[PDB]
Ligand binder design. Structure first.
Ligand SMILES: *[C@@H]1O[C@H](CO)[C@@H](O[C@@H]2O[C@H](CO)[C@@H](O[C@@H]3O[C@H](CO)[C@@H](O)[C@H](O)[C@@H]3O)[C@H](O)[C@H]2NC(C)=O)[C@H](O)[C@H]1NC(C)=O
Ligand SMILES: *[C@@H]1O[C@H](CO)[C@@H](O[C@@H]2O[C@H](CO)[C@@H](O[C@@H]3O[C@H](CO)[C@@H](O)[C@H](O)[C@@H]3O)[C@H](O)[C@H]2NC(C)=O)[C@H](O)[C@H]1NC(C)=O
Lengths: 49, 262, 52, 49, 52
């Protein structure tokens, strides 16, 4: 679950797969700019630390 | 050996504010700040690459930067990285700059332009380090233990790292159109400008030399320098040239290594 | 292991040797832009931008 | 920790672009219409809307 | 505190400093430090550069 421990998970350090659940959401850009605004819940690893 | 920093050029991006509370396209735009070093040493990223002259030669004095689709160089001195106080600069190569700063809430990077004006970009960043161990000291003492920790090295060997480059977009401009009398001319200098007009079925395509319309006013033709010839960057603040993209790969300097701290 | 249209040449010895960038820079960038997924990309990039 | 990858936006003007799905972790994509971008020299994509 | 300083004719610094407790809060409901590149526009007041 996003915002807590295990927001992203990998079976192994060398494994290619990944499962991430971080609620990454997009927003409409403001007039007269090119910037791709997004919002996202902060990483769980930092807050567990 | 290889000189990978020949197919890269500085670009101009959009900065949140220029040190005074107003936003304008600066050549010193600040990209992501990485701070995964245990002793607390930041890897800031410019938009204008450093340590290389205009002529693609490794020089410890000339720093490249972009201005109106033209590359100029400035003196390495006056490169100031600032936080609540005044930081110290350790490394310098490519787009990346290694800094050590006192605790603070925002950081700015500033350089002198060709005509000696300050160009500065400022970004919010809650920097507050904690030294490794169980005591929250400030500077190393002259008698203590040794603990392993991590930091960024100055070596530039193989690093197994990625940064993505792509061909720059069609840069728009309006200076190159000059209206004299019922006609306009397009400025030249090597920029194979792409043009699109509306008067009389218009004229669609790209040219390489001076051209004249003789038919309509300025507000129907457009100047879009294609440039090409050189990878710029994958930045969020500049558009792409094709949907499926092309993408490139460049190794960044300053990897991570183990050291000992006191 | 790298490919150019219908060439299929080893990545260690590109057919543009020497001075690929100097002789045709745009062709060099386009050719490198089709080998990003190929494992043998770094040797190709080393060969492309290294000539005396 | 995770690393949010934000590729440069693609602005197709005097036309439209269609979003497509890809197999990437927490992949997100959208299209916005009615944009009027600006750059350092002047607003490109002459088509007004 | 705040001090103001100017050079004299003979390059001698002349300064004066006063006790003043300066601590601004931006208008709104966040106490951010510098403006972001995506957000709302809120009315506020400022001094203008015009000397009329
Ligand atoms: C700083 O020192 C640490 C301690 O040695 C380094 O971490 C070590 O990195 C090696 C990689 O060469 C790890 O070996 C690994 O072993 C596993 C099997 O358990 C294997 O599957 C991997 O492919 C790899 O061979 C080693 O385990 C690891 N040590 C620990 C305690 O995690 C580190 O690389 C050094 N450098 C830094 C941190 O920058
Ligand atoms: C050069 O600029 C002109 C406009 O200044 C561009 O013309 C524009 O072309 C697009 C598609 O070719 C038009 O969009 C759509 O066209 C269809 C055609 O039937 C129309 O039914 C739709 O409602 C929609 O408008 C666009 O309207 C048109 N702009 C005009 C006529 O003012 C032209 O594409 C530019 N040249 C190049 C090479 O892009």
């Amino acid at each position: 679950q996003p915002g807590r421990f295990g927001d992203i998970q990998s079976r192994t350090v060398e494994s290619n797969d990944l499962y991430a659940n971080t609620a990454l959401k997009l927003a409409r850009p403001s007039p007269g700019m090119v910037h791709v605004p997004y919002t996202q819940t902060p990483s769980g690893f930092k807050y567990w630390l | 050996h290889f000189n990978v920093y020949k197919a890269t050029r500085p670009y101009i991006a959009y900065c949140a504010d220029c040190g005074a509370g107003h936003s304008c396209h600066s050549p010193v735009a600040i990209e992501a700040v990485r701070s995964e070093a245990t002793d607390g040493m930041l890897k800031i990223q410019f938009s204008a690459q450093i340590g290389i002259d205009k002529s693609d030669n490794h020089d410890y004095t000339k720093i490249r930067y972009a201005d109106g689709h033209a590359i100029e160089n400035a003196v390495r001195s006056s490169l100031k990285v600032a936080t609540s106080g005044d930081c110290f600069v350790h490394g310098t190569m490519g787009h990346f700059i290694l800094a050590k700063c006192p605790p603070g809430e925002f950081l700015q990077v500033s350089i002198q332009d060709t005509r000696n004006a300050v160009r500065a970009c400022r970004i919010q960043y809650h920097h507050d380090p904690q030294p490794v161990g169980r005591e929250k000291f400030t500077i190393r003492p002259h008698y203590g233990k040794e603990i392993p920790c991590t930091t960024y090295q100055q070596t530039t060997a193989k690093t197994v790292e990625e940064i993505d480059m792509h061909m720059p977009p069609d840069t728009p401009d309006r200076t190159l159109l000059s209206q004299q009398s019922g006609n306009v001319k397009i400025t030249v200098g090597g920029k194979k400008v792409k043009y699109n007009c509306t008067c009389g079925t218009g004229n669609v395509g790209t040219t390489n030399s001076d051209m004249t319309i003789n038919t309509c006013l300025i507000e129907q033709c457009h100047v879009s320098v294609t440039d090409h010839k050189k990878w710029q960057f994958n930045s969020p603040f500049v558009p792409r040239a094709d949907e499926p993209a092309r993408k490139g790969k460049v190794h960044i300097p300053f990897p991570l290594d183990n050291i000992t701290c006191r | 292991m790298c490919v150019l249209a219908n060439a299929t040449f080893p990545c260690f010895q590109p057919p543009c040797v020497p001075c690929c960038y100097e002789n045709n820079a745009e062709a060099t960038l386009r050719m490198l832009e089709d080998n990003v997924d190929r494992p043998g990309y770094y040797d190709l990039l080393q060969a492309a931008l290294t000539c005396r | 920790e995770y690393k949010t990858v934000v590729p440069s936006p693609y602005v197709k003007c005097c036309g439209a672009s269609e979003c497509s799905t890809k197999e990437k972790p927490d992949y997100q994509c959208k299209v916005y219409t009615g944009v009027y971008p600006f750059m350092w020299g002047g607003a490109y994509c002459f088509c007004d809307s």
